[PDB]
Design a protein around this ligand. Structure first.
Ligand SMILES: CC(C)(C)c1cc(C(=O)N2CCOCC2)ccc1O
Length: 212
């Protein structure tokens, strides 16, 4: 038998309000969610490249810096996998819910004035777009300093962080989107290629689509 430690955290007040706003209001442009995830994946990769200045040991990695997309129609999930820096426990808690973001209220205000959900990234809260198409989000992450963790929230006010004892993934972050029944278009290969070409064409790393 294996064992994992679980922690439940409250979402910062305005993050929780934002998550409600997304989950219960219709928008679409929803496809911008993929660009946000690829962008964050791209930053984690930039950090790996710069960390080398403070830790030359990083250069010794055989791992290729890239982004993989994996649609699974049998399970109704879309997974975005990167080989970036990863996130320690503190990084997950601080950056995925617990700390205030100075752009949160302003964004909820812009949205109420009909601004496009596509502005989410420039307000400092782009990750919560994942909730435009997913009823539950699992974030598997592995950083050099620390253990592998899984973050998870079906929304509802909180999120748990636990030490992941599942399949090791090596350095990086894996975002697993459990799609709402009506968002199945994001499992199709033609739909997937359309939004990448459309929103993530200038990304500096290889992006790969795995089909079937
Ligand atoms: C936080 C989230 C889920 C948006 C995300 C984080 C990373 C990640 O590992 N980060 C740590 C290093 O700095 C960039 C974010 C990579 C992809 C991704 O979608």
């Amino acid at each position: 038998m294996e064992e994992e430690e679980v922690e439940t955290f409250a979402f910062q007040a305005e993050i929780a309000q934002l998550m409600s706003l997304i989950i219960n209001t219709f928008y679409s442009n929803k496809e911008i969610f993929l660009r946000e995830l690829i962008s964050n994946s791209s930053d984690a990769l930039d950090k790996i490249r710069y960390e080398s200045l403070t830790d030359p040991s990083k250069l010794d990695s055989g791992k290729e810096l890239h982004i993989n997309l994996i649609p699974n129609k049998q399970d109704r999930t879309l997974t975005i996998v990167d080989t970036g820096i990863g996130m320690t426990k503190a990084d997950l808690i601080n950056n995925l819910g617990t700390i205030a973001k100075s752009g949160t209220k302003a964004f909820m205000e812009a949205l109420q004035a009909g601004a496009d959900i596509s502005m989410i990234g420039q307000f400092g809260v782009g990750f919560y777009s994942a909730y435009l198409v997913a009823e539950k989000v699992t974030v598997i992450t592995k950083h050099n300093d620390d253990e592998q963790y899984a973050w998870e929230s079906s929304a509802g006010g909180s999120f748990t962080v636990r030490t992941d004892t599942g399949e090791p993934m090596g350095r990086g972050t894996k975002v697993i989107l459990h799609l709402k029944e009506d968002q199945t278009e994001y499992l199709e290969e033609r739909r997937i290629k359309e939004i990448v070409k459309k929103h993530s064409q200038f990304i500096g790393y290889p992006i790969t689509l795995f089909v079937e």
